[PDB]
């Protein structure tokens, strides 16, 4: 999930936008 | 500002700024 992709690893704009509505 | 480790409230703040009017879902498992 988002914590594994953005907190325990380095986040990206692509990954953040995966979670927008 | 998004290409770093973002944890806790900092990650939720990044989603808020990036997603804007689209909103977002935060599911930390």
Q: How far apart are CA B2 and CA A3, in angstroms?
A: 14
When CB atoms are compared, the residue of A8, A9, A16 closest to B18 is: A16
Name the experimental technique. Answer: X-ray
Interface residue A14 vs chain B (CB under 8 A)? no
Cβ distance A3 to B19 less than 8 Å, yes or no, reads: no
Alpha helix (H) residue ranges in B1-29: 9-19
Chain A residues whose CB is inside 8 A of the B23 CB are 20-21
Beta bridge partners of B24: A20
B1-27 b/e with 16+ CB inside 10 Å = b? Answer: ebeeebeeeebeebbeebbeeeebeee
Resolution of the entry in angstroms: 1.4
């Amino acid at each position: 999930g988002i914590v594994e992709q953005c907190c325990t690893s380095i986040c990206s704009l692509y990954q953040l936008e995966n979670y927008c509505g | 500002f998004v290409n770093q480790h973002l944890c806790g409230s900092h990650l939720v703040e990044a989603l808020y700024l990036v997603c804007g009017e689209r909103g977002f879902f935060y599911t930390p498992k």
